Amino acid sequence: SGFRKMAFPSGKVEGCMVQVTCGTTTLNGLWLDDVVYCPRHVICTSEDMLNPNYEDLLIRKSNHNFLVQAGNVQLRVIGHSMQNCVLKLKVDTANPKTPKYKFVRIQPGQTFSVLACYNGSPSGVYQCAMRPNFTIKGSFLNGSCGSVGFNIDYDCVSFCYMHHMELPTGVHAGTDLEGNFYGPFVDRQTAQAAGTDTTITVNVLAWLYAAVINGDRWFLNRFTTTLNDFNLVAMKYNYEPLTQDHVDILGPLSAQTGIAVLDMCASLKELLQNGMNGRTILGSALLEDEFTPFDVVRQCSGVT
Amino acid sequence: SGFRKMAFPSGKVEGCMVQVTCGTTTLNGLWLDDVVYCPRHVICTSEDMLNPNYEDLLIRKSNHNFLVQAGNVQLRVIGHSMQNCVLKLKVDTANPKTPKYKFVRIQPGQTFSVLACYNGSPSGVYQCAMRPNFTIKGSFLNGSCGSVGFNIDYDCVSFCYMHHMELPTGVHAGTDLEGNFYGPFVDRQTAQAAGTDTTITVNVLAWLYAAVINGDRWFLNRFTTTLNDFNLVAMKYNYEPLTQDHVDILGPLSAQTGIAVLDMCASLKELLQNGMNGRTILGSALLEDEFTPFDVVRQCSGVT
Ligand SMILES: COc1ccccc1OCCN(C)C(=O)c1cc(=O)[nH]c2ccccc12
Ligand SMILES: COc1ccccc1OCCN(C)C(=O)c1cc(=O)[nH]c2ccccc12
Numbered sequence: 117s118g119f120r121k122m123a124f125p126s127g128k129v130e131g132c133m134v135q136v137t138c139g140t141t142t143l144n145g146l147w148l149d150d151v152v153y154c155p156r157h158v159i160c161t162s163e164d165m166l167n168p169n170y171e172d173l174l175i176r177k178s179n180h181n182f183l184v185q186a187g188n189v190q191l192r193v194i195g196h197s198m199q200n201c202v203l204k205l206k207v208d209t210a211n212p213k214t215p216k217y218k219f220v221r222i223q224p225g226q227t228f229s230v231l232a233c234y235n236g237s238p239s240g241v242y243q244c245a246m247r248p249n250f251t252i253k254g255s256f257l258n259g260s261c262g263s264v265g266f267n268i269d270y271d272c273v274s275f276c277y278m279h280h281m282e283l284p285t286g287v288h289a290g291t292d293l294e295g296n297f298y299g300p301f302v303d304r305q306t307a308q309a310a311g312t313d314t315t316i317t318v319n320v321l322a323w324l325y326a327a328v329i330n331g332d333r334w335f336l337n338r339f340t341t342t343l344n345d346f347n348l349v350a351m352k353y354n355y356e357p358l359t360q361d362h363v364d365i366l367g368p369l370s371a372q373t374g375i376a377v378l379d380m381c382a383s384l385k386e387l388l389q390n391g392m393n394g395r396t397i398l399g400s401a402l403l404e405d406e407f408t409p410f411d412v413v414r415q416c417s418g419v420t
Numbered sequence: 421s422g423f424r425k426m427a428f429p430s431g432k433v434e435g436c437m438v439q440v441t442c443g444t445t446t447l448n449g450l451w452l453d454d455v456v457y458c459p460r461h462v463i464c465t466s467e468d469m470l471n472p473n474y475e476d477l478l479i480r481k482s483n484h485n486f487l488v489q490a491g492n493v494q495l496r497v498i499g500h501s502m503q504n505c506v507l508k509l510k511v512d513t514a515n516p517k518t519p520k521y522k523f524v525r526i527q528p529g530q531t532f533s534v535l536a537c538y539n540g541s542p543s544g545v546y547q548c549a550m551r552p553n554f555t556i557k558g559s560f561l562n563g564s565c566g567s568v569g570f571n572i573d574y575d576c577v578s579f580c581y582m583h584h585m586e587l588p589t590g591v592h593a594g595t596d597l598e599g600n601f602y603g604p605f606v607d608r609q610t611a612q613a614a615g616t617d618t619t620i621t622v623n624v625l626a627w628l629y630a631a632v633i634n635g636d637r638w639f640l641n642r643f644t645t646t647l648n649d650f651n652l653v654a655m656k657y658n659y660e661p662l663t664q665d666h667v668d669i670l671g672p673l674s675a676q677t678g679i680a681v682l683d684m685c686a687s688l689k690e691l692l693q694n695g696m697n698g699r700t701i702l703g704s705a706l707l708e709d710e711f712t713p714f715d716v717v718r719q720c721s722g723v724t
Contacts, residue, residue: 117559117560117561117586117590118557118558118559118560118586118590118591118592119559120544120546120558120559121425121546122536122544122545122546122559123427123544123545123546124544124545125430125431125434125535125542125543125544125545126429126430126431126545127429127430127431127432127434127435127542128431130429130431131431231429232426233724234722234724235724237724238429238431238724239429239718239722239723239724240424240426240427240428240429240719241426241427241428241429241430241545242424242425242426242427253422253703254422254424255421255422255423255424255426255719256421256422257421257720257721257722258722259722260722282421282422286421286422286634286635287422288422330590331590391698392705394695396706399557400704400705400706401696401704401705401706402700402704402705414543415544415559416561417561418538418543418561418562418563418564419543420537420538420539420541420542420543
């Protein structure tokens with residue numbers, strides 16, 4: 117028992133991290149097979165970032181301007197191209213540590229692990245949710261761009277995120293591995309509105325199920341509700357409206373605990389309306405939304 | 421910016437995990453050089469665990485009874501010995517993935533990363549504190565024994581914990597890598613009192629400094645206190661008494677923010693006496709004690 121904000125083991129991703137330098141700018145790259153992927157803003161200077169013309173900036177660069185180093189060794193760059201907001205540097209050597217991998221575009225509300233890196237060296241790993249407004253609340257400092265987000269299904273790494281920037285509000289934005297930003301964000305130093313965010317209802321319910329499984333049961337009540345009634349409360353408290361698709365995804369946890377999904381919704385309704393009254397659930401004094409129903413089952417079953 | 425409960429990258433430790441089976445029991449082992457370390461209770465049956473005589477149980481075992489498998493491949497066991505609560509299985513092959521490593525006995529209040537494993541396969545990584553009462557609040561299921569806790573200083577892995585058991589209260593106990601339990605615990609299925617736990621004061625103060633660095637400042641006040649006055653409040657709220665050694669360890673964070681340690685103690689005193697009033701600090705609605713002052717500086721500087 118016990119329930120922690122657990123990240124995937126980062127080893128398979130650590131073996132793919134490299135440092136990419138272009139001019140005076142250094143960030144991280146992801147080396148998979150004979151390609152290194154990195155944010156295109158590695159080609160910018162401080163002058164450029166207020167409104168960069170990436171096409172023009174990239175035209176001044178040749179393969180030999182992209183310095184790619186895999187720890188101690190230098191990679192030879194034999195091609196470069198820009199795809200959306202990422203650069204793809206073709207190298208003459210396939211990464212011998214390339215795991216089985218896929219590039220996926222995750223949905224808002226899904227979770228993933230981030231391997232924070234600086235100068236191509238991994239520094240730490242943590243678990244994130246992609247917020248409903250397509251930002252992530254990460255931990256990133258100067259030099260962290262190019263750090264990636266991923267999930268692991270046995271031996272296959274699904275890369276879903278590459279870090280690009282910190283908004284003036286202190287939240288983070290980035291792209292899928294094809295360089296498409298999540299959300300409305302652009303890679304320029306401008307004020308950028310992140311939409312109104314909401315709490316990921318299906319994840320809060322999954323975490324209440326994790327709490328019951330792990331013995332924290334004080335919040336269970338004698339009530340039930342309907343999707344309609346619960347959604348009036350979700351609207352008032354800025355929670356995502358719950359749908360039958362969310363109820364269906366919670367099916368396995370409902371079966372495991374014997375607590376019908378709408379009865380758990382009634383517990384969540386009372387917690388939203390009354391608060392925790394100074395109590396905690398799984399070591400938290402707030403309603404946690406960074407665990408999906410798949411995360412809760414994986415953690416509560418023992419998936420390797 | 422941003423502040424997350426970050427674990428060390430687990431790659432160096434993933435390369436050391438193996439599965440150890442003795443009879444019908446399977447758990448994890450740690451393969452470093454030509455030795456595999458694992459909990460000695462791998463030699464027990466359900467019958468045995470209420471009061472095992474480990475010396476007698478081990479006498480019935482030969483090298484060939486210890487099945488050690490490193491993923492796909494089988495290791496040949498050429499020696500076995502028990503050291504405190506760990507078994508050391510000498511194998512005929514040194515682990516080619518052995519990182520630079522040390523065995524350390526951590527102090528209560530220090531933090532470390534745990535790589536949770538099942539059947540020798542890593543499943544997830546999370547950051548822990550060793551509680552002042554020598555338990556950890558982990559996430560461990562059947563088959564997780566032998567999972568290890570560690571810290572990483574550049575290329576050196578300091579192993580500090582091997583998981584052995586879950587107390588009836590749902591908290592976790594284990595040993596250093598010489599097999600000495602942290603705390604008063606024994607490896608038998610008996611009710612075992614974990615002492616009165618306390619909140620790690622120096623870590624809460626370090627995390628308040630992390631909050632100020634990352635922009636969460638609402639809790640700063642116009643007050644100051646003394647070590648004596650603050651310790652009366654710490655006593656009332658079951659916090660560890662703060663010492664000058666703790667003040668000295670907070671020196672770098674005090675210098676970085678310009679907030680004197682005793683002024684931060686006055687903010688913590690007001691939070692203890694008044695609560696958070698429904699506000700949050702770094703995404704938490706409670707006072708977090710799982711970040712040491714070294715963790716806060718590492719996370720806020722960019723250490724790889
Ligand atoms: C305004 O910046 C950008 C805007 C759009 C596109 C790229 C921009 O640059 C990114 C800035 N870089 C390079 C960082 O490594 C960075 C990333 C981060 O998440 N946090 C930071 C905090 C402090 C200093 C730097 C960072
Ligand atoms: C009462 O158990 C012990 C007592 C003293 C020494 C060893 C004992 O066994 C450990 C039990 N094992 C083997 C586990 O893998 C385990 C570890 C864990 O932290 N949580 C669990 C939750 C559910 C089922 C099992 C576990």
